[PDB]
UniProtKB/Swiss-Prot annotation, chain A:
<protein>
    <recommendedName>
        <fullName>Thiol:disulfide interchange protein DsbD</fullName>
    </recommendedName>
</protein>
<comment type="function">
    <text>Required to facilitate the formation of correct disulfide bonds in some periplasmic proteins and for the assembly of the periplasmic c-type cytochromes. Acts by transferring electrons from cytoplasmic thioredoxin to the periplasm. This transfer involves a cascade of disulfide bond formation and reduction steps.</text>
</comment>
<feature type="disulfide bond" description="Redox-active">
    <location>
        <begin position="102"/>
        <end position="108"/>
    </location>
</feature>
<feature type="topological domain" description="Periplasmic">
    <location>
        <begin position="3"/>
        <end position="128"/>
    </location>
</feature>
<comment type="similarity">
    <text>Belongs to the thioredoxin family. DsbD subfamily.</text>
</comment>
From Swiss-Prot, chain B:
<comment type="similarity">
    <text>In the N-terminal section; belongs to the thioredoxin family.</text>
</comment>
<protein>
    <recommendedName>
        <fullName>Peptide methionine sulfoxide reductase MsrA/MsrB</fullName>
    </recommendedName>
</protein>
<comment type="similarity">
    <text>In the central section; belongs to the MsrA Met sulfoxide reductase family.</text>
</comment>
<comment type="function">
    <text>Has an important function as a repair enzyme for proteins that have been inactivated by oxidation. Catalyzes the reversible oxidation-reduction of methionine sulfoxide in proteins to methionine.</text>
</comment>
<feature type="disulfide bond" description="Redox-active">
    <location>
        <begin position="36"/>
        <end position="39"/>
    </location>
</feature>
<feature type="domain" description="Thioredoxin">
    <location>
        <begin position="2"/>
        <end position="142"/>
    </location>
</feature>
Length: 128, 144
């Protein structure tokens, strides 16, 4: 709240996962702290009952040059992924999210994966 | 405490962690990620630093939890190192994250300083440096 930037704050609080459940699909908008960046090529996100999802619709950020990955699309603050269902059924679905990235300070955090159960609540947050 | 469990920690070489957990010497557990750019470059540094005469005063080891934090599952991680370089890397396999969970490891690298009595004396989340190492040698309370 008073900062949310740099490497002074741990990843557990450096990310604000705002879950927006709509009628068309599920939109996950996690606010990334100013200093951390995630790899769009390693971001895992999917929600469906029995694998009835079309495809993970990313918003696409900017390309980041690298020494090992060469260059990939990364998110440094902006993060929005929409999950459109391929089946229109009022069934309960699970949400699998995996946050993988690194910090510009030379810190490499593991892909903290959190699975959520969509039973109907609107907003969702990890119970850590 | 859990001394028996700590001694059950097998490395990617299939050897017990006891090889670096004896003689009443301080231990330094460093966590890392397999498929990470930053960790990849640091891997060479870990070996280089571990070979330093000054760093030979502490048992510096690299531990990873197969299957934990979405990392490589058990049976895949040890196989990964088997095809890697550096035939002298003290890589330990923490099945389930017995060490990672107990220290609430959410970000790498993680530097766990174990005292000569076999207890966690210090825990740092991030990266260390030479000046910091010297400070630790002077006072173990000199965090960050």
């Amino acid at each position: 709240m008073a900062l949310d930037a740099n490497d002074l704050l741990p990843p557990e609080k450096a990310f604000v996962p705002e879950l927006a459940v709509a009628d068309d699909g599920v939109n996950v908008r996690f606010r990334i702290a100013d200093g951390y960046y995630m790899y769009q090529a390693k971001i895992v996100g999917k929600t469906n009952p029995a694998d009835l999802l079309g495809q993970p619709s990313f918003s696409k950020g900017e390309e980041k040059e690298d020494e090992f990955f060469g260059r990939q699309t990364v998110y440094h603050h902006e993060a929005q992924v929409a999950f459109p269902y391929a089946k229109a059924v009022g069934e309960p679905y699970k949400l699998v999210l995996t946050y993988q990235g690194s910090a510009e300070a030379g810190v490499c955090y593991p892909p903290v994966d959190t699975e959520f159960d969509i039973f109907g609540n609107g907003t969702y947050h990890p119970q850590t | 405490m859990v001394p028996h469990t700590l001694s059950t920690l097998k490395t990617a070489d299939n050897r017990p962690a006891s090889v670096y957990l004896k003689k009443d010497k301080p231990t330094l557990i460093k966590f890392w990620a397999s498929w990470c750019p930053l960790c990849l470059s640091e891997l060479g540094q870990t070996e280089k630093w571990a070979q330093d005469a000054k760093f030979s005063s502490a048992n510096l080891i690299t531990v990873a939890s197969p299957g934990f934090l979405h990392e490589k599952k058990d049976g895949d991680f040890q196989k990964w190192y088997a095809g890697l370089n550096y035939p002298k890397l003290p890589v330990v396999t923490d099945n389930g994250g017995t060490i990672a969970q107990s220290l609430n490891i959410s970000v790498y690298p993680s530097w766990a300083l174990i005292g000569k009595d076999g207890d966690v004396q210090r825990i740092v989340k991030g990266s260390i440096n030479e000046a910091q190492a010297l400070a630790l040698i002077r006072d173990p309370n000199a965090d960050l």
